[PDB]
């Protein structure tokens, strides 16, 4: 799928592109960097 950030993940399968989940900021957060 494809979430918007502050959208809430379960490890990463949530998270849009270039998005991951992060326990730090609460939800998918920018991985610009990969």
Same mark, same amino acid.
């Given at each position: 799928?494809?979430? =918007?950030?502050? !959208? =809430?993940? =379960? /490890? *990463? /399968? $949530? +998270? +849009?592109? $270039? &998005?991951? +989940? *992060? *326990?730090? !900021? =609460? !939800?998918?957060? &920018?991985? *610009?960097?990969?």
């Amino acid at each position: 799928e494809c979430g =918007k950030f502050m !959208w =809430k993940c =379960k /490890n *990463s /399968n $949530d +998270c +849009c592109k $270039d &998005l991951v +989940c *992060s *326990s730090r !900021w =609460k !939800w998918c957060v &920018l991985a *610009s960097p990969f």
